[model samples]
Target chain A: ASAYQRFEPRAYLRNNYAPPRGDLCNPNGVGPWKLRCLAQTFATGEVSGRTLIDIGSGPTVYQLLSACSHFEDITMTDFLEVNRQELGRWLQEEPGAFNWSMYSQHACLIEGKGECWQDKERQLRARVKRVLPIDVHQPQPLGAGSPAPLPADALVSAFCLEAVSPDLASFQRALDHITTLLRPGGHLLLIGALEESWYLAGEARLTVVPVSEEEVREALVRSGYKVRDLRTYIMPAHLQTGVDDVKGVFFAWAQKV
Target chain B: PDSAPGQAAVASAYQRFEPRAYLRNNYAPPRGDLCNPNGVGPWKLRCLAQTFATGEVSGRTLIDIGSGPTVYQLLSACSHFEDITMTDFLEVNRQELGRWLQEEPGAFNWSMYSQHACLIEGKGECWQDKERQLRARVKRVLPIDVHQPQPLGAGSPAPLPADALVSAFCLEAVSPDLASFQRALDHITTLLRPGGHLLLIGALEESWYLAGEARLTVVPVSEEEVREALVRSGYKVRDLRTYIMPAHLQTGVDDVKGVFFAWAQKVG
Candidate 1:
């Protein structure tokens, strides 16, 4: 009856979530295409001001590599405690941490900085301050902040809303819920699959809202944001993971107005 | 791990069956905008027209299944083919096509498309002639159920087969699942004779599309699947071309990122 009820953070990482592929540090051959797309979005934008909160951060830090340079304060959040613990383990430099240097190197290539992967990794470790839990489906989801409900300068999320929500209305409410932590002029970066009805992560098969480009635009407008840039990349035919028949992915940059 | 789309789950989603909205969003625009060069829409329209124009169509009978009230694909082939049959699943869409055939007041003007088709084939100022020929040759407008082995199922007084079949945006849009899509394609093949031709035009990698108020599902397929489907259904690929859209075309009406046009021949 539940869509993502069986998802286990460690199991998900073992099977589908590799950060980099080959020596080119290019993940286009091995990893999920969304990471590179997200890195490119950050590489092209001015995402630094004060604080950047990555909502529904899951167990991976690959998405935050490019934007780490701009923000002094970075907070990672997820709905599951297991994911938070995994992130915390990495933040503390546990002896057996997941390797993210490949991703940092790939991100460096995207940022036009050659092989500065080690520097990026160190900077990221220094910047990320906390790994907290948040229930995006609830009102005032981020209940605790050291600055006491500090609004973020920027919010970046990937494949979280549609992956967790069971239907369209739930997705709309989740979008509205996550917007509350953003300052009026802060930017929100969202990335997700288009036309993907479901996906497999370990033993779990999660339902996707099968969003259209029109619906994404409408949702942003309804939630009181001015969409700044929208980009879409068609997934190559060879990459159709039976886990999800994702036709393509989209990146939307919007401002909380 | 994904299961088939549940009926109850599908109903809970915001999908209304709106025919007028479909026409307004897809067909109401001026021909120039509908087929503008800035976007691949125009190129797709031209590709289908040109496919029909340049291909050998010396058949006496040609049937267009799931025609959906549009004639952009038929303007060129009408001259070579003597008899044309147009079929649809919805009465409203069929009626829309009828109004154009009967030349009723304020019918959807497709002269621009005809003009464009004429220009592509290097025949100047023959748009009116081409339109008249298409309307005249389209002798039957019947209802069809592509899911049935006998596609026109219980409706046709006699079993009629064609020398050629052309379909656009129907199979992918109407089928609820991939099995249904493959089966429907099989059923459609039953209507074509051995050694007959099939020209198909449809969206590629589209998850879903909105027709009016109704949000219809699309089976996001790749060119590989299209070829595989055709070969499995007993056909040989004669020609295949795809048009990828320029970013300017993402107007948000539907997730139609691109379309494919193919010419195939049925093999024994």
Candidate 2:
């Protein structure tokens, strides 16, 4: 009906990422994707022990891994069935794969994917780990309620919202979706494609008009969030407007009060 | 104790009964039970299988531990796997299985049954079974004693082995205590080389069980407990599901409640 009507990916793109995704996406991606921002953000003690939401983290779970390693607890949210399924599988397996090697690899990127700073691998395990199967564009109230055992500490969404809402009304809607779930003083981090990456939703081709730094700040304020910190990442070698190589994220640290 | 044939007969009898008991015991009562093909456990495990197929390429080795009575894993593996191994702890189990294959038409082998299965000698431990005797096609079925230190077997797998390992409805019930279960997990995950995968599924919220008059206690973990416990084991959680069997939820059976399915990798 409208240009913004189709933000969801064609079902194929949702399932397009089966495992053996190659080393392309694992340990996070090649460029400074959302994860790199999450790494730098949390390192400053801005997002620790806080409830966070990892939005649209594909089968590649770098988003969850980033927040889980530092934040108190997190709710991994996704719009696709397969994306949620991948998170479920990773949650079960990461512990067994926790070791010195993984630790050494992500030493600078994120903390080891284990339980704690020690040999205890299961330490970082979520005090309240829940995977709610919901669509981002038109998320229904979680049936049987959100699996969250506790309120969120901070909210983190990477490359998900922009894809879900290509326009202002829908973008605001996605923010409202998480706000009902977020507690006051919670932090929100979104690392999205700045007009790069074409997304599909079951036969729908779409591009989310990425927000500017000030626009993100204003959106948070309009949606009842007090902005604390905002960081804008502009890719070094950006192509022409429509062909931008994938500009990085803007971190909007906001508090409810 | 008995000759091969005699062993075969007892094995046959047990095999027939094992699934009967296994399904009845391991799964919640039929309807709405998560184990139902349509139910959550089955659905989740099926998804895990899809992940497995994608994770491995041809010629990769797959070991199915505690394979129980059903040959579904074996059947599915054949479609994509280069070499496949299936193992259960009891020889009466194998003899019983062999007998069933021979006597019961269509009981075990479906159109997809693996003629490739090498039913190895039972040594009461998995890692130590006489893997040598098994055919080149053999993926040894070593006896697993959840109570023992090295449940796979006494010796343990040699260094740098197995592209992937899959265990179902086996680990959570290693003992009623979390310690025993974790200990068993440590042992099993140790067997896999770096980058190897471990697929685990087990009854969640189950208090314990009785195996033919033998009391079997399961270490039940809330979804939270399991979610946390798994990461410590060695791998990042590749995928997981807590399928609440409808039957168990409805009938309110004795403590046997849910199934937690996971696909974990043994990373460095």
Candidate 3:
């Protein structure tokens, strides 16, 4: 828990997401790959619902850019206060907020919809009703007596569980905990690091659990989730960047049984 | 006229509504006692008790849309549901309900109401047991505004699309006009699930009622208008009952001519 105390948003954003890593022009890059995975999954229309929650949303909106059009009520949550403040700055369009226009434009281009990126951002901003705090380790992630409605129709989490948990056991436990928030037969679109731990966020050196593809699949099955779709992307040698020893990324689309 | 100011006016007027005085006026003496020959209280209780005994209105969760200081409406309902949420527009009313649910001293007495409910059900259950069960079943008392798109407010802890809803003397009493009444009804309907039950009780053809210093306005809806509003709000009116306010029972509290009880199911 103390590891994240030194975490700085701008420094972290610059380290991994700056320039070469976040460049949307490179279709094979991690940013575009994650976005494409999300956009394609949502295009099937089976994952649509009235309420969509982003569990452990770490100062990012790209994960929900495609989802805003599909859901009417969206809730963004994060464990860290600083990350939530960062998210608010971007959502409220405050001065010197991180620019995500390129991400919106890329999402629109891939979606092939005639709508402009500004409209997409506006819709996303309007649909997000609340940005409450959440801890994936808790049985009730949004606190025991939170006003936010539970048994959500769908859940979207990106690089949150493995990044936060200290060990693989805690990772699986956290997975089971957040699963309680999703209703039976609801879908969970999860994205996380696969193998290779430890990442730098400013001065904070965050330790990852280093989960395998099979472990993720087994954990979902054990947590009463039927794996619908699981895709893995091996990080290219040059794009590795040495910011984190993240060997690859996994995108799993699972439905609660 | 803009409906915003009207809503504001209604809010302001309700500030002076004394829950204790209102209780005395409506739930006491010529009006309150179940055994009183001229009382309309037993009739309302009978209607609600009879409706819940059918077993058709049973559900996992139930929401009382605008519960005033009274617990009479939910006496029969507690037997059928484990999760019951009571709501009101005013904090005082919410606190009034809280006092009873928590069994706080100085709370309004509802023993006769519970006794009548048990007697009508013919279950031979103790009245104390009924009140205890009702208190246990009631899980929350939250704020609500029927005029808002989300009556319980956005992201309310109360579960959305509740299996059933029970509202008594709330919509018409709070609304400024007929249009606002219809809109409030429609707004609250959004909180109920498709095919869910809505057990509603309200005054008919009454323009205003006095509560302490506040003279609250009523929309004066007729039987036809009530049925029409239900149908327009996507409900299939299963049962509709009306009771005329007897001359002696009219204690000059308000010009309430009659009371209407509706058991409607939202169309799937």
| Best by the TM-score measure | 3
What is the per-residue lDDT of model 2 for residues A1-257, given as tens digits with 9 covering 90 to 100?
14334333224332332222212224333333344555666667666665566665554444444456566566666555655665565456644222222221232224322111222224334432667765655544343466764456676666666666758677778777767666666666665555445545454566666666777777788888877777765544322222223455566657776
* Per-residue accuracy of model 3 over A1-257 as CA lDDT, tens digit each: 68988888888788766778877766678888888889999999999889989998888899999889999989999889999999999899997778887677667656755344677889999999889899888877898777567778999999899988999889889999999999899999999999968988888989999999999999999999999999999988887887899899999999999
Query: Quick one: best lDDT, which candidate?
Result: 3
Candidate 3: which pairs clash? none
Clashes of each: 5, 66, 0
**lDDT of the candidates, in the order given:** 0.74, 0.52, 0.87
Tens digits of per-residue lDDT, candidate 1, B1-268, equal: 2323532333333235455566666666531353344445456566666666665645888888888768777877787788888898777778888899999875777765665565455543245677888999988888877866888876573236788998988887766666667778899998898998898888888877776566666778777787888888999999888877556555577787677888889995
Docking class of 3: incorrect
Better of 1 and 3 by TM-score: 3
Best of the two (2, 3) by TM-score = 3
User: For candidate 1, what is the DockQ-based docking class?
Assistant: incorrect
Q: Indicate the worst ten consecutive residues by lDDT in candidate 2 chain A.
A: A112-121
TM-score of chain A of 1: 0.88
